[PDB]
Design a binder for this molecule. Structure first.
Ligand SMILES: CCNC(=O)C#Cc1ccc2c(c1)NC(=O)/C2=C(\Nc1ccc(CN(C)C)cc1)c1ccccc1
Ligand SMILES: [Ca+2]
Ligand SMILES: [Ca+2]
Ligand SMILES: [Ca+2]
Length: 292
């Protein structure tokens, strides 16, 4: 479902997008550098709009990059309040561009790094969008839900950015959020692994013993991937998070993908019903958290 706010914004996005024409390299002025995704906050000179320009260095033939572009045209169709807006994609001087909606809060990975750890009420709302994002995508499949893959903003929006719509792009160019069975329900797992990472403020594999957990409130890359498979999943610490929340992530982080909760089930899980109901000023927290 969409509100008459979420609908109005999508009309305001499209109309401001219909004004923007065919994207060319020369029509962009660099404002600043956002970070490695390398993404620039740009200004589309003729339209006067502000965008996020991802630039991928790729040594490939014409017939290759022309495919990549054709596959990214599919992102014009895919419009949702839980998916980051798309303006276009092209190739120029030895690099493919992807011109997209500028989310002035940056990634949850960034917000975590400055927040410390994210509050439950807040992670309530993050969970709701990430589900509706995945539920929109379903109603093509997704590629890996990280906190670096979730963008947020001062309006109070929470959107999935960078799912995989182009195969050859993935080809031509971490694995620590993958579900064991990948070594559809993998998406839910990652949301479970992520929410925990943000709730406690640290990557939860391996788990912190009572030494850190008491105070709060390294493994080599391939050594980890084993532990993920052969040992039990991470869980929120008890006593500091509500049990409704503890159950949610538990039902997400089940190793056996069948016994793991699906999208339809999570969407009506007590945690969601509680949060959706809650009246939380997300845009306050964020803006005050990261100083805007
Ligand atoms: C082809 C399919 N689509 C994609 O591949 C894509 C994408 C994409 C990727 C990143 C961004 C985006 C879109 N829009 C944005 O605003 C992004 C970022 N904004 C952003 C960062 C920091 C501050 C402020 N900081 C510095 C405090 C503000 C804003 C961002 C950039 C680098 C790393 C993390 C996030
Ligand atoms: Ca250029
Ligand atoms: Ca140029
Ligand atoms: Ca020129």
């Amino acid at each position: 479902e969409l509100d008459e706010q979420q609908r109005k914004r999508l009309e305001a996005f499209l109309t401001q997008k219909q004004k923007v024409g065919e994207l060319k390299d020369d029509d962009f002025e660099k404002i600043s550098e956002l970070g490695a995704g390398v993404v620039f906050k740009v200004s589309h000179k003729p339209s006067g709009l502000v965008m996020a320009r991802k630039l991928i260095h790729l040594e490939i033939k014409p017939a290759i990059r022309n495919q990549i572009i054709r596959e990214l045209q599919v992102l014009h169709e895919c419009n949702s309040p839980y998916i980051v807006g798309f303006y276009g994609a092209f190739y120029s001087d030895g690099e493919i561009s992807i011109c997209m909606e500028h989310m002035d809060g940056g990634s949850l990975d960034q917000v975590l790094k400055k927040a410390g750890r994210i509050p439950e009420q807040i992670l309530g709302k993050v969970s709701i969008a990430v589900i509706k994002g995945l539920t929109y995508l379903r109603e093509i499949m997704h590629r890996d839900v990280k906190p670096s893959n979730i963008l947020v903003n001062s309006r109070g929006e929470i959107k999935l950015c960078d799912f995989g719509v182009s195969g050859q792009l993935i080809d031509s160019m971490t694995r620590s959020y993958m579900s064991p069975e990948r070594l559809v329900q993998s998406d839910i797992w990652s949301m479970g692994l992520s929410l925990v990472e943000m709730a406690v403020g640290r990557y939860p594999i391996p788990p912190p013993d009572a030494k850190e957990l008491e105070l709060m409130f390294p493994m080599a890359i391939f050594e980890l991937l084993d532990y993920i498979v052969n040992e039990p999943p991470p869980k929120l610490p008890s006593g500091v998070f509500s049990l409704e929340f503890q159950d949610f992530v538990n039902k997400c982080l089940i190793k056996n993908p069948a016994e793991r909760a699906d999208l339809k089930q999570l969407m009506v899980h007590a945690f969601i019903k509680r949060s959706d109901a809650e009246e939380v000023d997300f845009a306050g927290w964020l803006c005050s958290t990261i100083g805007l």
